[PDB]
Amino acid sequence: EEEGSAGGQG
Amino acid sequence: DQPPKCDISGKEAISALSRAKSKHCRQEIGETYCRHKLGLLMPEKVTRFCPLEGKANKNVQWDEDSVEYMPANPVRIAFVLVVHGRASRQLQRMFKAIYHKDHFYYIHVDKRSNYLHRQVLQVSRQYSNVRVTPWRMATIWGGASLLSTYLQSMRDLLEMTDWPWDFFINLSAADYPIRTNDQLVAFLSRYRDMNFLKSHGRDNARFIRKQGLDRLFLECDAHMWRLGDRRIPEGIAVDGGSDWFLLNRRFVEYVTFSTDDLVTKMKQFYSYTLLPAESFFHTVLENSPHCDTMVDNNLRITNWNRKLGCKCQYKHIVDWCGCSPNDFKPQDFHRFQQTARPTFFARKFEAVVNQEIIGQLDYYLYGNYPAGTPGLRSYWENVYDEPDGIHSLSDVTLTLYHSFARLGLRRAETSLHTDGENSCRYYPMGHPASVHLYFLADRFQGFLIKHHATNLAVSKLETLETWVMPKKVFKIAGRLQFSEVGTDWDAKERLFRNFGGLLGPMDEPVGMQKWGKGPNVTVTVIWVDPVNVIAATYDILIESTAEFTHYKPPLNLPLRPGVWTVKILHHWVPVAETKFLVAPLTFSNRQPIKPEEALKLHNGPLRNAYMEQSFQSLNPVLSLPINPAQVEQARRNAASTGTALEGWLDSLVGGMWTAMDICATGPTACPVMQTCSQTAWSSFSPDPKSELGAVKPDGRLR
DSSP states (O other), X not given: XXXXXXXXXX | OOOOSSOOOOHHHHHHHHHOOSHHHHHHHHHHHHHHHTTOSSOSXXXXXOOSSSOOOOOOOOOGGGGSSOOSSOOOEEEEEEEXXXXXXXXXXXXXXXXXXXXXXXXXXXXXXXXXXXXXXXXXXXXXXXXXXXXXXXXXXXXXXXXXXXXXXXHHHHHOTTOOOOEEEEEOTTEEESSOHHHHHHHHHHTTTOEEEOBOOSOHHHHHHHHTTTEEEEEETTEEEEEEEOOOOBTSOOOOBOSOOEEEHHHHHHHHHOOSHHHHHHHHHGGGOSSGGGTHHHHHHHHSTTGGGEEEOOSEEEOOOHHHHBSOTTTTTBSSEEBOOOOOOGGGGGGGGOOSSOOOEEEOOOTTTOOHHHHHHHHHHHOOOOTTXXXXXXXXXXXXXXXXXXXXXXXXXXXXXXXXXXXXXXXXXXXXXXSSOOTTOEEEEEEEEEEEXXXXXXXXXEEEEEEXXXXXXXXXXEEEXXXXXXXXXXXXXXXXXXXXXXXXXXXXTTEESSTTOOOOTTOOOEEEEEEOSOSOEEEEEEEEOTTSOEEEEEEEEEOTTOOEEEEOOOOOSSOOOEEEEEEEEETTEEEEEEEEEEOOOSEETTEEOOHHHHHHHSSXXXXXXXXXXXXXXXXGGGTOOOOHHHHHHHHHHHHOOTHHHHHHHHHHHHTTEEEEEEEXXXXXXXXXXXXXXXXXSSTTSOOGGGOOOOOOTTSOOO
16 A cells, blocks of 8 residues: 555654 | 774764774775765756656556457566575465566575575576576665666666567565466556556655655665765655566666766665665656656555554664565455456565465466375475585574484384394484475474484485474463464564574573453463573563563573473463473584583573572472472583583483474385385475476466
8 A cells, every 4th residue: 555665763 | 994084973974883893894984974074975956857747647547358458569578586585485486477488587696595596596597588697785675785786687688688578577585476477468568668666655755754865874784874964956856665666678778878967866866875776766767758657556566564564673784764564364365356456466475474375376376286286285495505504504503403313313213113133223424414494284394304324234324304393382271372482573474483493592582472352461471490490570461452472581691401481370370381492502613512611501690590680489389399409410411511411402302392204315224214205294295386397388387
């Protein structure tokens, strides 16, 4: 459904 | 260690300079930092050649009748497989499902995975349309080297004149097709001038911050170092999403050979980017002269479940938190029949996690196998291969693979019942030649050790394979379903990646519990070492939604070797218990352990206690008396080496593992030994679903 593998800095 | 060329004052840059190991890695960090400080590393503005106002997104209004016709001029695909790991048989199964002689296959194996590479070579040698990349990079997760892998293979593929390909598809060993090859070719033949990339579609500013695209990153020592900040170049649109796509030859030509302001600067910008392939190809396309070819659909299904797949699991590899899609299960099969949009591939699939859904999907596409086909429900996975060396192993796995081999040798002797010469007595020789995991019906069955031994009756070397299975140790006396101890807990798939539970003195066990539906409850946990010493105790809250719970108690090392015990209580009421083995090591640095080492390792922690808080009070209240003799024998065991130490270990393994069977690979003098190729469990037994043979008239292998 959604895309983007990075979660974030924390 | 000469100082840098500029004063380095950034918190991020200095934090990286400290944790870095190699000198080369320290200087390469300083150079990168000083270049960007002077404004000479990252571009500031970029030319946009797209004539459109923004994004195009040409639609492919899907009707099932779009994949039924026969193309008079079918496309020929260049499949690029970026693989890594041990699942050589699963990769062979998927390669068998996507193969057609008219296509081409270019395989890049991670530098870390030499075993997998040796197997892939045997495939490239059988088929003229299969080749392996002579170059191999350590493609860590999020590493910038992934885009460098793709961009090189595109260059290499465009220069292979004898390969007239039209599309470019990238697949991993965890991908699998969800539609036939005939339908793929028909669909792509009708849209051969399009490019298939999937965007995030959500907020763009939040996508940039979450992806860290405004952060400087460097790949070095197999790590992604976060060095500082950077600005987003002005005058261009930045987009991204999934890094699995299909690109046509004309657009691959542009990315490779163009020298305009867009491609040149974007190759510099993304050389220092985390997860570049998730954004580089989108940005270039939407800002290039080909911006009117973008279809906002990668033709993939990705099993995203952020409730399980986002645990900042890559923290030790990159300076950022990462997410990972989950593995499909049998209940997810109906999702592969969805009508909404066109989809041809899906991920992720892991045989060691769940093979049933793989078998279902493959037979749904290409039919069942004949009756009597062996091995359809089994899976084998090599975990050690002789050419990689025993220094590739640890001291634990080496001590315990030797033990399993001996355990198998003792079963051969006891199997032959006779009063004369025992032609099934063996003397072990050398080191294991290979090890395999073994699964049946998605149930772990144990290890398969291949090893050499001398048959003492005829005084000849023989090659053998042994199957050992662990003994069930979980006992119930409620919401509790299971309880286990091990290392390498996978939070995403909620299981241990150390399957055998192989542990040594210096390891750090983790106690997991599995719960079913019910109201909240609080339980108690108690750890007990082999001589009835209570190492730790703690209570846990099991909420109504709790399905799995785990924890790693802080125990001073080394642990006392032997059979440990973990008990669960509910207000003094026993609930269940489980047992795990802490094996004493017969190897130190891959050499026979010395007394000064064995002494200092097999005799409890260096602080005479596992924690600061003691628990001698609970021993009488649990019928756990400490015997002065067993404690004495444990201290006498710690001193043993060689033969005596071998008898100690093998006695522990024997009490926790079962030699299920043993087979010979070649001729043997033991009359009660079956040939490995004739068994059902051996890695030498037939496994046609993963075996690659000659091509058929339809150009297929499956």
